[PDB]
Amino acid sequence: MADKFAAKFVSHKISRTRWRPVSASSLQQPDVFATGSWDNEENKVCVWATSDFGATSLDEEYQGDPKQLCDIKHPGDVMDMQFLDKERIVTGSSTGTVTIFRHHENNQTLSVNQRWEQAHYHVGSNMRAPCTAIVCSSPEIVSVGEDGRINCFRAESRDVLRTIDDADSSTMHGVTFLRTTEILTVNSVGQLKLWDLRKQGNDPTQIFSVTGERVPLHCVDRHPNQQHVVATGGQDGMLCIWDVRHGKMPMSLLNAHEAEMWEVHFHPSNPDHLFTCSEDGSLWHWDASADSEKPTFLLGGRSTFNISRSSIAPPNANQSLACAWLSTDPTKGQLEITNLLPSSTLSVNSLDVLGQNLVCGTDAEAIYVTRRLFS
Amino acid sequence: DNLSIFESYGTALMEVVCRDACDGHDIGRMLALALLDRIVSVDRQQQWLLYLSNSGYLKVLVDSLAEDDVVLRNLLTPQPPLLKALYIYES
Amino acid sequence: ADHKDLIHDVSFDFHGRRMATCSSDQSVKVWDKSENGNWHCTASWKTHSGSVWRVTWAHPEFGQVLASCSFDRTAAVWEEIVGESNDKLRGQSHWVKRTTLVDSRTSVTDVKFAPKHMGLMLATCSADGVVRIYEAPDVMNLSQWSLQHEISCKLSCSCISWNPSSSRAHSPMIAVGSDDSSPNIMGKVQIYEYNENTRKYAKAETLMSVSDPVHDIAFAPNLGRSFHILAVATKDVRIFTMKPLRKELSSSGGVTKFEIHTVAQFDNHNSQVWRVSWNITGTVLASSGDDGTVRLWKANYMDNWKCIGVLKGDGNPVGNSYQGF
Amino acid sequence: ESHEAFNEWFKHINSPPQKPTLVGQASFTEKVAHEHKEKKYEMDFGIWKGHLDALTS
Amino acid sequence: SNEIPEPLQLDFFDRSQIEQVIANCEHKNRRGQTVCNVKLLHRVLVAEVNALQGMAAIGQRPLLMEEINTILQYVVERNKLLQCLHAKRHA
Amino acid sequence: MEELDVDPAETPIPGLGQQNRHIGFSWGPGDLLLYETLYQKQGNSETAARCPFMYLVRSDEDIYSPVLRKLFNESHSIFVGLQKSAEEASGKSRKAQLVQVSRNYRSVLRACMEEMHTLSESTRETAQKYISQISILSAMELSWNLCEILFIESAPAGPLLILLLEWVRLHVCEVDNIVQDVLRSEKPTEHEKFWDGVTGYVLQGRMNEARQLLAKEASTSASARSMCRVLDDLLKKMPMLHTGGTQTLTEFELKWQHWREECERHLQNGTFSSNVHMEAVCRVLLGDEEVLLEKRDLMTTWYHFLVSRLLFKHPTVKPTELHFYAQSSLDMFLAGDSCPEPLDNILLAAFEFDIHQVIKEFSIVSSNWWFVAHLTDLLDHCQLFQAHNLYFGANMREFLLLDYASGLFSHHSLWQLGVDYFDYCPNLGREYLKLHMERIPLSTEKKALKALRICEQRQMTEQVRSICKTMAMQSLCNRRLGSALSWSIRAKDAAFATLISDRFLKEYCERGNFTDLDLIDNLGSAMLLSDRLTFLGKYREFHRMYSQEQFSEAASLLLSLMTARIAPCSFWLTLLLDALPLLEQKQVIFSAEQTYELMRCLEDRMAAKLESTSPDEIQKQDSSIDNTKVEMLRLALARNLARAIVTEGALQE
């Protein structure tokens, strides 16, 4: 509000809030973001700007309270979106209305480019299929639904050329990446399904689970660089972090945080800092996204962490671990618990970190903006 | 007082002296071995020797004995080395 | 026709994205590699009134500028101009001739580009031993140039070699090689250095040992540091290693003290080699000539070159193997 | 507690106020830098005034 | 206190390039260490920052001059520390 | 192919062979390609879809496998871990870490062999190739374990035979195959191969199940109870490496002598005779050659023959005679119906030692650079004298890492290990990475960000600027002005910045686009690199200040703009025109000297503008309108200076 970190009461559902690369990946500091207005009266994408401390690139004044720089309107709904380009933003809907908007950097405004009223088409037109998670990469944008419905769009043309509508069990919420011909989907119980680019008929291809602890998986995200790196956060913690994309059943088991994790975000600039939110009002910051071998920032959690340089050994006889294969002990480290906020907020929905600023939308219709001080 | 200070220090200086004596050269190794001999002579509780035997230094002592045997073979062979080897073997 | 007459020049992109083909069909064909796999015909159009001879791309610090050479005593410059390429849409590639390079009365043998640093040093060699270097006076327009350098050597021209400068107190030199289908002229390779004290090119080295016609010279760039490798395709297989000795404190680009000796001599063509390949730093060498014979050599953990493939192209084929590996 | 609060308030009021950090003959980039410095100085001055009011109370 | 003399130490660019420049600027002179001449080191730094550019270079000359002046003050202080260390070694 | 002569193109049929093809070469991103060029004879080339005669030249195609790349990644990860841990001191800890990493390597190799066996069982046609690859991997693991137990430990007599027997029983499955073949029969105890399996188990060393099978045979056959009892009583004298204080060979020799004496006494008494099976067992255990050559179905190869000889002939052997015994074993094995083999010769060389020559033979025969790199790393960890030259240059590990990096970059995916493998080399690795990351394409956003993060972790600047310029020109070709400007201000370049500035200039000249609040939202160095963004910001500030009413600040900003001189003539005209709204007013205190200097600066600026437009003339199409605007501006300025003089005269009252 007027002291310490920024706290605003926008009084609206904080669905999908993501920082745009307009003020990022440049000399300017990140401060401009976008928010979808899902579960409201009118699903509108609003571009806002926060107020950070100091002034390194003509930042906002006061002590906080973000302000809406612009807003766009569309008859479709708002689910989520993945920043494929700085000026292109593709948002899906649960009623089959894909909105591709054109953001002008030289104008700081939004223009309605494409509104696919007949999206998810491949053998005709006028098709309505709900969507749950839409993620983009080079050169395909993949959207998943609830009953296993998959939709694929190209980045070089404005058309849909792949719509697979099968009959799957349970419910799938989220989608990660692997390569140009593999898709890994998580279930709401603890199952992992591996599908190919050319799959016909019912019956999933490969289904795997984790022995021991099986909690409902919730949020799942992919690494912006290596696609085979997956960060998952569910109920009591059950992610299968792996630096590859082979093997049958996942040999990794990282069980921590009994509270339900609703979203786990990555650092877009330097993909080596993960930020995880808790349902009891907690924000954990993990370092070294598995592949990055560096000294860990404090332990915490049932994980193997990473190894660094070792020197100064006694003239006796030491050891250097061993080799074992089991589906119970962890294999890849990732969780680095950092005590930041034990219990301050009654509920927390989503969070997003960029450069040195973290936005956090809570379930009580509020937003918090905090400038990081650690590393 | 010296023994009490050594016991209060613990195994840090002991391990340092052991490393300097094992992974040494000639004069330094001989001086460290003489210091160990003197501290063993002035010892009274044998806990230092017990710790040396429990820390697994038996293989290192065997290697030191093998090095001493190699030095003795080199001395028995013609053309002996420096005169410091005699004092090293004496210590 | 459709690549059925006399093949002229085929070229590939250093990034593995585009390829260009030209022949006696009075037109060139530019193909693009698909993002999912394989390639297909992307575009095909007329670049010159006569038979297009050579075609070379530009440095990755500019774009995909096509320098189409032909026997019409001219040289066309083309750029893939897009149309409605907005958002997730790619416009139609409209081939528009921006400018042209013409100042001689003979055909062009080779053409290459230059990095940033100063601008765009465009080189054009004629069929009589005369090369010309043009500079772009502006950066917001590619329809103008000024002839800044002219080098007239002996005999005719063939290929040119440069040096990507990146270090200190180093200037990109120019290596020229004369040829006339007659191994009777003493000295065929020359090297000119851009002396900065006069801001002009000056003589540096002249290989008086080689007397055979030089059809092309493959240079191994090393960022202007360490050593250099020069592969010459005369009558046999010749590869030399140029090692820097010392630099004087008086000449800022005049006379140089370089040593060049034979480090890889291999005779197997027994004819006239016309072209030689170039890989990373000299690993796989494919030599071809005007006799229907291709010789392949590989460099293992030593420094020699063993014969690993003798492809025929003048007689009759005996089999079909190793066509895609 | 009173002596601790008095020492805190005394050091707070002895700490001199910040300066806008600007000089003469400024270009456009220098003007932008001076504006950023003035903004950060205003933020620091507001924070210091709040802290001083709290300590004084 | 110990007076450790450092030849060149930079902290405005990447640490990899800083270490590369430090390793490149290593040669004997007249003081006795691996330091260079007060003007020759600045000339070498100017040549190094000039040979690694692109096309745009405006507003960098005053910053380079300030960096050169700071490096000159640093090497002057390090030469004073070197004289102090030499006097201490003589004592 | 790779040593002989390649075959020409087309089929050897007359129709397609009447015209030969002079295949030409082409280069690109390091992957050489072959194109169909015609010479002398004619050709049949076309220009349509795909490539003619499926010309897809690519090397190292057999290494591309889903499990192979995963195993290589795991091996290189544990290799990086070993190099990170190698900074410790020397002693027994280094040998323990070496044994641990060797066990981990053998475990991951066994896992790879199991995965290859599963793939072979899944496939059908490639079963022979998969079995060949499995045998090659097994031979590699055998050589690795032999090198680890021979060169690293270098133990003399005593535990060497036990370690060799353990390695043999761990890497040999022929005894298990014989046991399975015996169990396949309806009567395993009455089978003729049961005694062979028992002798094989005794040779391997597992005495528990051997004695169990002997007791079972004694309980089954009625004429073998006392025989098996005597055999079990004799086998109890086997020496299982006694430790009576230290490693002593006297106890081993005494136990072997007692065992031999007991066997001879039993054979002379008769309790170990009068039975064909046990007689043949004793004749084999005594230590012969022709009997083992006949029963070669039990043993494996030359190493199995050598360990059998060393177990059934001597108590223990010394390293001075181990090579002689291995050579004699290989000799008589080749004499007894066999043929030479490259892997057999490599194993013989490894037994004959000389690490330099064995790694030379390895590099000559096998092309696996990772194996030689691991061997050199183990030899360096063992604190041994190694060669500092690659028999031509210097440092073999750097050359091996460069070869592996080239082989990995030959692929189209996974280029993360090459970064650390080049960072490990503080010599040619820097330039190699700088040449490879600039030669690989940087078009797609995924690999663009990958290379950006790689060069950022490497802490470079030239590569960053090159990637930024490449993505900026890509955005310019795709019509992304904002992205191009962001990339330009990231690379600190001004070419694309001035290009976008001229684009904005022509857009304003065409339609008049000036609503650009990006500079007011965020700033930096773009306003210093260019002039269009600075002009837009100054115009917005002037508009806001005129809306908030401040004639003093208006005059100050006008003087600042006139002294700075921004934008060309098309906007200099508007900058000079922007003065009438500040001149028609009559209120607000105005100073006489201030008005005088303001009008002087305005007249000097208009004179400079007229001189810079053209020598003593004007251009464009706005001539009479410009003259009328100048006249009305001069009239307004005269009125304003008159009002200022009036105010100055009235203030001093």
Please give the residue of chain B at the shortest CA–CA distance from A312: B19
Query: Residues with Cβ < 8 Å from A7, sequence gap 6 or more?
Result: A1, A64, A366, A367, A368, A369
- CA C307 – CA C320 distance, rounded (Å): 19
CA distance F492 to E58: 10
| Chain F contact present for C181, CB below 8 A | no
DSSP state of F228: H
Instruction: Please report the DSSP string for F556-588 in residue order.
Output: HHHHHHHHH--S-HHHHHHHHHTTGGGTS---S
Residue that the structure tokens 């394989």 belong to: C38
Residues of B in contact with A316 (CB under 8 A): 55-57, 60
**A109-116: strand order across its sheet:** A88-91, A98-104, A109-116
Q: Which amino acid is at F568?
A: P
Beta bridge partners of C240: C230, C262
Neighbours of chain D (3+ CB pairs under 8 A): A, F
User: The dihedral of CA C315, C316, C320, C323: what is its sign?
Assistant: positive
Distance from CA of A346 to the nearest CA of F (A): 34
Q: With CA atoms as reference, report the closest residue to A89 among F485, C88, F476, F471.
A: C88
For residue C267, what are the contacts with CB-CB under 8 A and spacing of at least 6?
C236, C237
Cα gap F619→F608, rounded to integer Å: 15
- Cα dihedral A81, A82, A88, A89, rounded to 10, equals 10
Q: How near does any CA of chain F get to the CA of B2, in Å?
A: 31
A&C contacts, CB < 8 Å: 23
Residue environment code for E14-42, b if the CB has 16+ CB neighbours within 10 A, otherwise e: eeebbeebeeebeeeeebebebbeeeebb
| CB-nearest partner of C116 from E47, E50, E55 | E55
What is the DSSP annotation of D5-19? HHHHHHHHHHSPPP-
DSSP states of C128-141: TSEEEEEE-S-SS-
| Contact in structure between C95 and C28 (CB atoms under 8 Å) | no
The verdict on A60 touching D (C-beta cutoff 8 Å) is no
**Which residues have a Cβ under 8 Å from the Cβ of A67 and sit 6 or more positions away?**
A48, A49, A51, A60
- Are F and B touching by the rule of 3+ CB pairs within 8 Å? yes
Joined tokens for residue A174: 């989220």
**Inter-residue contact F394 to F14 (CB < 8 Å):** no
Q: How far apart are CA F390 and CA B45, in angstroms?
A: 57
SS3 A162: strand
Whether residue A158 and residue C87 make contact (CB cut-off 8 A), yes or no, is yes
Torsion sign over Cα F640, F641, F645, F647: positive
Nearest to A161 by CA among A179, A182, A175, A140: A140
Both tokens assigned to F154: 């270098």
Structure tokens at F495: 């070419």
Q: Check CB contact under 8 Å for C310 and F49.
A: no
Phi first, then psi: give them for residue D47, nearest 5 degrees: -60, -45
A 119-138 residues with CB < 8 A to F: 137-138
Asked if A312 reaches chain F (Cβ–Cβ under 8 Å), the answer is yes
Neighbours of D25 (CB within 10 A): 5
Q: Tell me which residues of chain C have a C-beta less than 8 Å from any C-beta of chain A.
A: 35-36, 86-90
> Residue F510 — φ and ψ, nearest 5°?
-80, -60
- Using the beta-carbon criterion (under 8 Å), do B59 and F92 form an inter-chain contact? yes
Phi, psi values for residue D35, rounded to 5°: -65, -40
d(CA F494, CA F465): 12
Q: Which strands, in side-by-side order, build the sheet including A273-277?
A: A264-266, A273-277, A283-287
d(CA A372, CA A38): 28
| Structure token pair of residue F194 | 């049961």
Would you say F395 and F372 are in contact if contact means Cβ atoms under 8 Å apart?
no
Chain F CB contacts of E55 under 8 Å are: 493-495
Chain E residues whose beta carbon lies within 8 Å of the beta carbon of residue C117: 55
Handedness of CA A110, A114, A117, A119 (dihedral sign): negative
Contact A27, F526 (CB under 8 A): yes
Residues of A in contact with B56 (CB under 8 A): 316-317
| Touch C-F: 3+ C-beta pairs under 8 A | yes
In sign, the C-alpha dihedral spanning B28, B31, B37, B38 is negative
- In angstroms, the CA C214 to CA F30 distance is 25
Q: In this structure, what token pair is assigned to residue F389? A: 């030259």
What distance lies between CA F178 and its chain's CA centroid?
A: 43
- Residue contact B23–F246, C-beta within 8 A: no
Phi and psi (nearest 5°) for C240? -115, 155
Pair type for strands C217-220 and C228-232: antiparallel
Instruction: Tally Cβ neighbours within 10 Å of residue C188.
Output: 26
Peptide bond into F315 cis (omega under 30): no
Task: Measure the CA–CA gap between E14 and B58, rounded to whole angstroms.
Answer: 50
**Cβ contact (<8 Å) for F89 and A312?**
yes
DSSP class of residue F256 equals H
The values of phi and psi at residue C99, to 5°, are: -145, 180
F17/C3 Cβ within 8 A: no
Q: Mapping DSSP to helix (H, G, I), strand (E, B) and coil, where does residue E12 land?
A: coil
Does C116 sit within 8 Å of E51, measured CB to CB?
no
The number of residues in chain F equals 653
CA of F134, closest CA in chain C: separation in Å? 24
**Nearest Cα to Cα of residue F574 among F641, F625, F515:** F625
E89's CB contacts (< 8 A; 6+ apart) are: none
Q: On the CB side of A368, how many CA atoms lie within 13 Å of its CA?
A: 21
Is F460 in Cβ contact with E14 (below 8 Å)? yes
List, in order, residues 6 or more apart from A210 with CB less than 8 Å away: A190, A238, A240, A249, A250, A253, A327
Instruction: Give yes or no for a contact between A267 and A257, defined as CB atoms under 8 angstroms apart.
Output: no
Round to whole Å and give the CA distance between F310 and F199: 15
The CA distances from residue F165 to C141, F171, F240, F312, F347, in Å, are 79, 10, 12, 12, 16
d(CA F482, CA A86) in angstroms, rounded, equals: 8
Tokens of D44: 């620091």
In this complex, which of F23, F363, F499 lies closest to C311 when CB atoms are compared?
F23
C-beta of residue E5 within 8 angstroms of C-beta of residue E85 = yes
Reported structure resolution in angstroms: 8.7
Beta sheet of A357-362, edge-to-edge order: A6-8, A366-371, A357-362, A350-354
By the CB < 8 Å criterion, does A56 face chain D? Answer: yes
Reported residue count of chain B is: 91
Give chain B's radius of gyration (CA, Å): 15
Distance CA F150, CA F353 (A): 8
Backbone angles phi, psi at A298, to 5 degrees: 65, 150
A1 interfaces chain D, CB cutoff of 8 Å: no
Residues in CB range of F615: below 8 A, 6 or more apart = none
Q: What count of Cα atoms within 13 Å lies in the side-chain half-sphere of residue A271?
A: 19
Q: Which of A285, A327, A15 is nearest to A192 (CA)?
A: A327
Q: Any CB–CB contact under 8 A between C243 and chain E?
A: no
- Residue of F88, F92, F243 to mutate, interface with B, max B Cβ within 10 Å: F92
Token pair of F622, please?
A: 């706005």
Neighbour tally for F589: CB within 10 Å: 12
Chain A partners of B21 at a C-beta cutoff of 8 Å?
A: none
**Cα–Cα dist F9/F32, whole Å:** 17
> Which of F430, F493, F499 is the mutation pick for testing E, counting most E CBs within 10 A?
F493
In chain A, what residues touch D32 (CB-CB under 8 Å)?
58
Distances (CA, A) of A80 to A143, C52, F229, F607: 10, 53, 80, 59
Chain D: nearest CA to A54, how far in angstroms?
Answer: 5
Taking a C-beta distance cutoff of 8 angstroms, is the pair E79, E64 a contact? no
Strand partners for C309: C296
- Chain F: nearest CA to B23, how far in angstroms? 9
Kindly determine whether residue D29 and residue F525, on different chains, have CB atoms separated by under 8 Å: yes
Kindly state the helix (H) or strand (E) to which residue A133 belongs, with its residue range.
Answer: strand A133-136
Residue A82 burial (C-beta neighbours within 10 Å; 0-12, 13-18, 19+) = buried
The minimum CA-CA distance between D39 and chain A, rounded to whole Å, is 6
D38 min Cα distance to partner chain A (Å): 9
A 10 A CB-CB count for D29 gives 16
| Structure token digits, residue F44 | 């049949």
Method by which the coordinates were obtained: cryo-EM
Going from the C-alpha of A195 to that of each of F123, F269, F391, F567, the distances in angstroms are 21, 74, 50, 58
Of A27, A270, A316, the CB nearest to F93: A316
Establish whether chain D is in contact with chain C, requiring a minimum of 3 CB pairs below 8 angstroms.
no
| Number of residues in chain C | 325
Whether residues E58 and F459 touch (CB distance < 8 A) is answered with no
- Residue F547: Cβ within 10 Å count: 8
Choose the closest CB to C168 out of E51, E54, E55: E51
Q: Does residue F462 sit in helix, strand or coil?
A: helix
DSSP secondary structure letter of residue A5:
S
Instruction: Look up residue A370 and give its two tokens.
Output: 């905090």
CB of C40 less than 8 A from some CB of F: yes
Measure F573 CA to nearest chain D CA, in Å: 21
Q: Could F246 and B62 be called an inter-chain contact, meaning their C-beta atoms sit closer than 8 Å?
A: yes
- Determine which helix (DSSP H) or strand (DSSP E) holds C83, and give its type and residue range: none
